[PDB]
Design a protein around this ligand. Structure first.
Ligand SMILES: NC(=O)c1c[nH]c2ccccc12
Ligand SMILES: [Mg+2]
Ligand SMILES: [Mg+2]
Ligand SMILES: [Zn+2]
Ligand SMILES: [Zn+2]
Ligand SMILES: [Zn+2]
Ligand SMILES: [Zn+2]
Lengths: 131, 286
């Protein structure tokens, strides 16, 4: 009874991060010890003519990015654990997240390490037009 | 190839919207094409769902620098016999809004303690995972009849985990710098530990040089068994599954080969006492 959501290639990393006090640090450490990044994300097919903004209602990848379903790039959504936001709610679930193509092999790690500019809506260091 | 870990136990026929699905498998078939997913204009997100996610099937076989192994060898367990605490959990089944997973109901230890929890699960919603009470029932059968009154005597998990830490701390503070949970068929015991265990690198206590055995979500601090009053999580416990030592039949039949004083009173604590007792007889007697 029920429907599977996951593949065996993610069992170890998700189990490790589901028990950690600090899930983000556990994910970083798992990768540094030679572990594979989380796979089975929701990658979208799109026209690559989008705005390039980081977090959007519909896919907005430009030619330097890929678009993914938001929840699938969120470590806290993937491990079904508490979000570190004040009210425990997610900022990626229910949106699409644009990830630079050079980082698209590890969308979960990308969202953990990076920050969205609130002025222009693009990732700091990967599109932000403010600095 | 799929795993049962994080299986969606809801009864909703369809899968999720691409923005809400945690994984490609969980996206509804209607969005899948050309090896990936597409956003379909006019097909909205679901803003009211509650999908129970199964915590059966954890695999703690990672090898990460600075994080200790949870499962230990028989030789290591023998050196830490003073840290042995038998542990068994009797579960109840998800029902009504969900089906296909076991929830902890009666948590039993070789100290003779049984703690009863409210049936609680991990429910995904449009905004987060809600750790919450879920509909449940004991498994059917005369051997599970004793669990019926426990369905309404449970304590919330925030109280149960404080009681587990207090019990372990009182029992072990003068015996060991750690705990070794002695298990028989560990799958559901490991699923139950998700509710009261946290892991990380080896740490020291907030008030001494001893290794940390407890963690507090109140202050994000660590404590040994002496300084853990009020602490809510067991931190970096160790464990061993006795069944993996070459036994063939059930727990009771193997326990009874060496011991006669522990009659089966059919309860989580009794199974926890039998498991520790069998391990002690196998490793230290004759
Ligand atoms: N029939 C199916 O594959 C599914 C229906 N609902 C789901 C939820 C999560 C994963 C898969 C499914
Ligand atoms: Mg068992
Ligand atoms: Mg039992
Ligand atoms: Zn999330
Ligand atoms: Zn900017
Ligand atoms: Zn201490
Ligand atoms: Zn015995």
């Amino acid at each position: 009874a029920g429907n599977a959501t996951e593949v065996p290639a993610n069992s170890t990393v998700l189990s490790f991060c589901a028990f950690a006090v600090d899930a983000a640090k556990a994910y970083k450490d798992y990768l540094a010890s030679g572990g594979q990044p989380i796979t089975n994300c929701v990658k979208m097919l799109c026209t690559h003519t989008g705005t390039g903004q980081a977090i959007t209602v519909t896919p907005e990848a430009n030619m330097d990015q890929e678009s993914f379903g938001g929840a699938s790039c969120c470590l806290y959504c993937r491990c079904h654990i508490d979000h570190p936001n004040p009210k425990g709610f997610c900022d990626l679930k229910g949106k699409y997240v644009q990830i630079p193509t050079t980082c698209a092999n590890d969308p979960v790690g990308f969202t953990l390490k990076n920050t969205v500019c609130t002025v222009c809506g693009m990732w700091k260091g990967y599109g932000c037009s403010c600095d | 190839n799929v795993t049962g870990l994080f299986k969606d136990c809801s009864k909703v026929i369809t899968g999720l919207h691409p923005t809400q699905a945690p994984t490609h498998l969980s996206v509804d078939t209607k969005f899948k094409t050309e090896g990936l997913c597409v956003d379909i204009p006019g097909i909205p997100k679901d803003m009211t769902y509650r999908r129970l996610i199964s915590m059966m099937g954890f695999k703690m076989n990672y090898q990460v620098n600075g994080y200790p192994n949870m499962f230990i060898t028989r030789e290591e367990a023998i050196r830490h016999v003073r840290a042995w605490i038998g542990f068994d959990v009797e579960g109840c089944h998800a029902t009504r809004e969900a089906v296909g997973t076991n929830l902890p109901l009666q948590l039993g230890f070789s100290t003779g303690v049984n703690l009863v929890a409210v049936p609680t699960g991990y429910v995904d919603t449009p905004n987060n995972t809600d750790f919450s009470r879920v509909s449940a029932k004991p498994p059917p059968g005369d051997q599970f009849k004793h669990l019926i009154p426990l369905m309404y005597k449970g304590l919330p998990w925030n109280v149960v985990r404080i009681k587990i830490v207090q019990m372990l701390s009182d029992t072990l503070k003068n015996l060991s710098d750690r705990v070794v949970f002695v298990l028989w068929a560990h799958g559901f015991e490991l699923t139950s530990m998700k509710y009261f265990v946290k892991i990380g690198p080896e740490r020291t206590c907030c008030l001494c040089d001893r290794r940390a055995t407890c963690f507090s979500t109140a202050s994000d601090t660590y404590a040994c068994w002496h300084h853990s009053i009020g602490f809510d999580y067991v931190y970096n416990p160790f464990m061993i599954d006795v069944q993996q030592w070459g036994f063939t039949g059930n727990l009771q039949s193997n326990h009874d080969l060496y011991c006669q004083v522990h009659g089966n009173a059919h309860v989580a604590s009794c199974d926890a006492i039998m498991t520790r007792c069998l391990a002690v007889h196998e490793c230290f007697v004759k």
